Design a protein around this nucleic acid. Structure first.
Ligand SMILES: [Mg+2]
Ligand SMILES: [Mg+2]
Ligand SMILES: [Mg+2]
Length: 293
DNA sequence: CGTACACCTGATAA
DNA sequence: TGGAGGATACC
DNA sequence: GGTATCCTCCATTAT
DNA sequence: CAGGTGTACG
């Protein structure tokens, strides 16, 4: 685990969270907590174990869903000690940065015990209102006065290190093998390779910037909602640009075996064997093997 | 014959 | 992704 | 008591 | 994230 890879991976998968929960034991009647969270499927538990170890063995890993597990640090103290100084040095670049910085300001308030205070509380409520999904219904009603503190906007963010991209692709990227019915290929099917990164449209600009960074690909919009795709279909670019990149800058987690299989599919395609029935079945078999893992 | 971008849609693993 | 609620610990 | 963290579970949507 | 498909074009 490289630092930029981690930042990429968290740009893709992580969360920065604030809870303001109701409880009348607290002098304010409200308990304030901050949480840094990253959740993955079971097949990537070893990667959560790396992260913990990466962050000084801190925090806790727990069954989250039916086949996911979560890594969480919810101590304000140790968040201030370890997390904030990591992301302040190796900064996020998706819109998730806006949530990191707002989360940061809360911790800062918590750090001086202000959260235990009425003004403190409203500042944290004001800050929580611009983070992730905003105020809850309960908090809108308990704090009908508060004005969300403006979402910070940090313009034009560039990929700070090729490992960031390794990281993020390991999270929100994908190595696709498609077998497409073809009336004109003689073996019956086209063997397509697609590299693809998915992200919400709010990060259009970052998505656009990937075309210069990798010197290939194009961007599409999901017609069904605000979601973009950075896609590479062109096999020459996959051989020439994508495969060599991730060979130097390695994927993390399970997804790394899936890249290796896809690389292998590409060898078969390189020697033109995909147009042979034998090679088509090598590809069915590798494709079969992918995501297992 | 073969490939590649534009378009399409279902399943979760975030 | 991002959130909730109950239990427990800690000073 | 007041506060801070641990633990178990979940609805929706960005993957 | 992850499978497709339609079809223009060399
Ligand atoms: Mg993501
Ligand atoms: Mg993701
Ligand atoms: Mg992932």
């Amino acid at each position: 685990l490289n630092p930029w890879a981690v930042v990429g991976f968290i740009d893709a998968e992580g969360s920065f969270m604030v809870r303001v929960r109701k409880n009348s034991k607290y002098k304010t009647g409200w308990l304030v907590v901050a949480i840094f969270s990253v959740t993955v499927d079971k097949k990537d538990l070893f990667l959560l174990e790396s992260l913990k170890t990466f962050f000084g063995g801190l925090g806790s890993i727990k069954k989250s869903g039916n086949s996911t597990f979560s890594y969480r640090i919810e101590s304000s103290e140790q968040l201030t000690k370890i997390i904030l100084p990591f992301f302040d040095k190796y900064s996020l670049i998706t819109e998730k940065l806006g949530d990191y910085l707002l989360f940061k300001k809360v911790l800062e308030l918590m750090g001086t015990k202000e959260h235990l205070t009425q003004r403190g509380l409203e500042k944290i409520v004001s800050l929580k209102a611009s983070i992730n999904k905003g105020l809850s219904e309960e908090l809108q009603a308990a704090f009908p006065q508060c004005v969300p503190t403006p979402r910070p906007e940090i313009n034009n963010k560039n990929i700070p290190d090729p490992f960031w991209l390794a990281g993020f692709v390991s999270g929100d990227g994908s190595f696709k093998s498609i077998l497409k019915k073809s009336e004109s290929i003689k073996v019956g099917f086209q063997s397509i390779l697609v590299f693809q990164i998915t992200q919400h449209a709010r990060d259009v600009k970052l998505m656009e910037s990937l075309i210069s960074y990798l010197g290939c690909g194009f961007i599409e919009k999901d017609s069904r909602g605000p979601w973009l795709y950075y896609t590479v279909t062109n096999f020459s670019d996959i051989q020439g640009k994508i495969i060599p990149f991730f060979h130097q800058y390695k994927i993390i987690g399970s997804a790394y075996g899936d890249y290796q299989d896809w690389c292998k599919i590409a060898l078969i395609m390189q020697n033109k064997n995909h147009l042979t029935p034998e090679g088509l079945n090598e590809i069915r078999a590798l494709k079969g093997g992918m995501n297992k893992g």
